[PDB]
Design a protein around this ligand. Sequence first.
Ligand SMILES: CC(C)(COP(=O)(O)OP(=O)(O)OC[C@H]1O[C@@H](n2cnc3c(N)ncnc32)[C@H](O)[C@@H]1OP(=O)(O)O)[C@@H](O)C(=O)NCCC(=O)NCCS
Ligand SMILES: O=C1C[C@@H](c2ccc(O)cc2)Oc2cc(O)cc(O)c21
Ligand SMILES: O=C1C[C@@H](c2ccc(O)cc2)Oc2cc(O)cc(O)c21
Lengths: 391, 392
Amino acid sequence: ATFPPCARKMERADGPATVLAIGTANPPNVFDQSTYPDFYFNITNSNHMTDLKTKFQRMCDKSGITKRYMYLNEEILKANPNMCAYWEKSLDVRQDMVVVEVPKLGKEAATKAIKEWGQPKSKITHVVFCTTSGVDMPGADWALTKLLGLRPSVKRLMMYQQGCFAGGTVMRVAKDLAENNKGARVLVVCSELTAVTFRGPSETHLDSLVGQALFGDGASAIIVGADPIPEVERPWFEIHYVASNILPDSDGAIDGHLREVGLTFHLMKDVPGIISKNIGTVLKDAFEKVFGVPSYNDVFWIAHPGGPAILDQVEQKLQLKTEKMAASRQVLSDYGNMSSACVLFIMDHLRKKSVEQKLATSGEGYEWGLLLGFGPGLTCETVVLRSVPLA
Amino acid sequence: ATFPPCARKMERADGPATVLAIGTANPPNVFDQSTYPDFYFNITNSNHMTDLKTKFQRMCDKSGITKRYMYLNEEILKANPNMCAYWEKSLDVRQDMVVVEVPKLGKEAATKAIKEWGQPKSKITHVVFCTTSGVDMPGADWALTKLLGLRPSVKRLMMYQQGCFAGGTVMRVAKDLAENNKGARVLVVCSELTAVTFRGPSETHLDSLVGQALFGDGASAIIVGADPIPEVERPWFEIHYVASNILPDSDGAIDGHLREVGLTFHLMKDVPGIISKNIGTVLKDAFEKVFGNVPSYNDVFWIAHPGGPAILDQVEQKLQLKTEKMAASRQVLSDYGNMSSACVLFIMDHLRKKSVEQKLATSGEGYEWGLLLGFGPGLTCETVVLRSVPLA
Ligand SMILES: CC(C)(COP(=O)(O)OP(=O)(O)OC[C@H]1O[C@@H](n2cnc3c(N)ncnc32)[C@H](O)[C@@H]1OP(=O)(O)O)[C@@H](O)C(=O)NCCC(=O)NCCS
Ligand SMILES: O=C1C[C@@H](c2ccc(O)cc2)Oc2cc(O)cc(O)c21
Ligand SMILES: O=C1C[C@@H](c2ccc(O)cc2)Oc2cc(O)cc(O)c21
């Protein structure tokens, strides 16, 4: 039923896929969260909706967010009344922005990672581009290739309308790309901008208002490869296990639609409840596979900060000690919810802080760790990581 | 710099990624190409555009297409005048159709693939869903998973807004999922519906008119795995080499923009020209990596994305292929039109079946080796080197 087998025509690698560099970028406009409700109701000309703004100030005060970064600013929003409305035909001006600026922010994040990596751009064999912010043909993967001047034969994978869990997905994608191809070096870019999602307030769409309180802009970039070249490339985290779960009883929990008015956000179930009710089973299953067993307090944690109640309720249900989510909270406070890019920001802070505090390893002390993405399905992406030792 | 190595935690497979099953599906409405211009100019209130209709009749006549299948029909279009115009805000009505109908049609093709495969669907470990028709959150990958009742823990990969080259991308994607994961069985689904792209004619955007003559609807699905179970699973094609290339001097050749008027289609360079000048360089590099320092193009089987007949004609001319090589590619174009990322899988299925039918030596018309090519925006050329299986 088969011709006689031949050796793998495209050689594969032997070690684990390894993070060799991380770079991050954010748009230049900074928004204090504690005064953001004033700005938001000013720029949306909705100061007559008194009770709604009180509701929004509470949302912002309870977000665990201190500041956010956005491509949008006061000048740009005055120029587009249709994006300041809650529900006006927009998509076209929104697309005109994000199809340009999402590859641009990704390039700034990627240039940093390429620079830290140290190798020539020409060594990049694969490009994985992940966003939730607009679509186009050719995609932001093609645009990033041109902007960076990678070789025209890079193998690309364009991930559009992904959502918050895709920071975990890209790790699972790059794992197989890196491990199945000897010498493959994968450029992974997550890049998100709220220009598709910013909109005016409505008294009957309070979940849309939660989104206005939480979503920020940012781009993160990693170089993934297996078999790092000793004393030339420098490892930081190893990918050893990945898993995907549609959580029980979660149908319709989070929906997002791309419409003539832009991208709309819909909350319809207790998202922190469903995650925290089911996270025990998922991680226990992963740990049996990887180990078959360290404590949850003895591994490092990169958890997507969908919002603070997620991190809070996982922490309680699993009875974690409060430093386990500290790095994930650090990014949420410093940046807000940047959809897919969040976890890669958290990974970078983890390593930087572990180095700077002169700890044993890249993951704040521990040999093993977790990276968790959450979003729409309701989808939980699971990554078991190993760190590297340090001085 | 590293912790002590440990054995790979997730076992890998050893053989090549193999196609184990193919199924396809189309919407139920058939449109004869020869009289399609009469239907199209009438439904878009364009009967007065007398010379434009004569041009469109020529496009249809020279299209190499006999018929297409479409989810759209007469009743659906009359219910949506904003779609029968050239440039009205529609995207919402277009999304309402395709976010439901794309996973639906893919479900149809996937059930056929799974039935041929013969294994329990619970043994599917990965889902790759590929489309250029609509986007949604959660995606068509999620909806397909629910419709089929696959395991809740499948590893899903959602590929939106891909374009015509993506039939080769999913093969490339599926190669690494299957090979790096022992026991992985990947369901790959490409599902395309013209409801995103249909629009009335304009005398000044004849490239938009070109799309209206060529694009059809369809979905195709494959089961891809490595290390097949002897006597249980049946290999049909192996994936041995994958390559990707942005062709030189091709910026702007094919653009597609998702707007408030829906998906718009633009052609601003000689696309069959650019592909045919460069395909030799592309295929020569792939063959040198597979075979060293090498069969002739006439001695392999061809699965070429039929973006239009001029592409197949100009690759046939410049590479001096005998005319039989593109025949399978042209048969699918004839019977279905250009189904974006779904076509090549339709051509793959057609190839195997007529090889079995005519009792040829292999599943790729008696050749051992062959190509699957996808052409699209970028200009992106995706290259796959396949091996067939022998036949009794
Ligand atoms: C060329 C093709 C569009 C139609 O067949 P064709 O026989 O070449 O048409 P001919 O050139 O013989 O006929 C000429 C008329 O057709 C129309 N036409 C054909 N291709 C056209 C194009 N790219 N743009 C505009 N008009 C076109 C024109 O109106 C032309 O007359 P013009 O002088 O007014 O432009 C088709 O076979 C093809 O493959 N074209 C490009 C491939 C493609 O479309 N790829 C889709 C990719 S995802
Ligand atoms: O509606 C949006 C906005 C989007 C987004 C966030 C940050 C950013 O920078 C750009 C886009 O994030 C989301 C993530 C989801 O899981 C579901 C959603 O509906 C959305
Ligand atoms: O504009 C379209 C239509 C789309 C399409 C075709 C058939 C179908 O059934 C659904 C969508 O295919 C494309 C493929 C491209 O590379 C570029 C494009 O602009 C387009």
